[PDB]
Symmetry: C4
Subunit: 102 residues, 4 copies
């Protein structure tokens, strides 16, 4: 029952990926397309990419989400849902994207 969660918080950009069936080959493709590597950590198993020097405005956030969706679509992961919040105290926004296999 393979699902994937991608979470993106801004700014600066921090992208997390969770899903037991996620391949390192897929992580590498997103590394290359999100225009600086994803580092793996266990418990829970996940990939993290932080771009500490970068600032993404609203349009660039839209662009990051498209590259993630498109990259994952080519690798057999289908977008099923998204949600987002903003934290007034930190000034950060966090978006989650949820994917499933076909």
């Amino acid at each position: 029952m393979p699902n994937l969660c991608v979470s993106a918080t801004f700014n600066p950009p921090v992208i997390t990926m969770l899903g037991s069936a996620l391949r390192e080959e897929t992580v590498k493709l997103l590394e290359q397309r999100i225009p600086v590597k994803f580092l793996f950590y266990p418990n829970p198993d996940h990939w993290r990419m932080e771009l500490s020097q970068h600032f993404c405005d609203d349009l660039h956030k839209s662009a990051v989400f498209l590259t993630i969706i498109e990259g994952l679509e080519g690798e057999g992961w289908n977008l099923r849902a998204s949600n987002s919040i903003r934290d007034s105290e930190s000034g950060k926004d966090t978006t989650k994207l949820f994917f499933a296999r076909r």
Copy 2:
């Protein structure tokens, strides 16, 4: 259907409070999720009929919230419940966030 069968899972943090609503939700599916999420139980309340679990002691950071959502979605997928939509808000006054997950049969 009576009301064609859908499910709503809502999760508020922190501390974690998980609620599960849906006419066709069986107690056996609630018991499977009880095991995956973590020895805390869902309690049943009526009107609206639903199951509530509170992890009074626990604190979930963003990564662990993502993990909770993923475990809920994967456990429900195996039970025949497909994720259709999600939404979320944060309350600045309380510092709590609430995410809702909507599921339908396959």
Copy 3:
């Protein structure tokens, strides 16, 4: 083809106000939701420009659990009427203290 129209249902709390937009929404569907949502009964009223139906639940406050129940009953009721849930989003307004959720539906 064009294809079929879409539906947007929005709900703001509190107090609970439900609005429904969509050219192809039939009165029979509104009437079914009138009966399902509260569970003198409250009604949807029609207003033009933009054309929509509006219901307020009678001065209530709906806790987070009751908000989940309203959304489920809307989705379930519309699914039986041939409207399929495609997307949802929500925001909270810190200054009014109100939260708004949108549900978007397409024909099957």
Copy 4:
């Protein structure tokens, strides 16, 4: 296999942006006519290539935001772009709310 599309709407005042590598100008012009009608031009900018409309100097209330979303979704569906997901946030300091709609062929 195909590029996806993101339409973002921020209020107020209402500003609509469209981002998608495969978006045709006829689609943009169709929305250009449908949006003010449901409630002036989309202008092209680079880096990344996108389309931007300042729909009005007048403020949209919640009902008119609903109506903008619906007219966008309906117009894009007729052009072969299917709604897959949405998300939204509100910024308390700026007082602006931003909604993103994601579409696929």
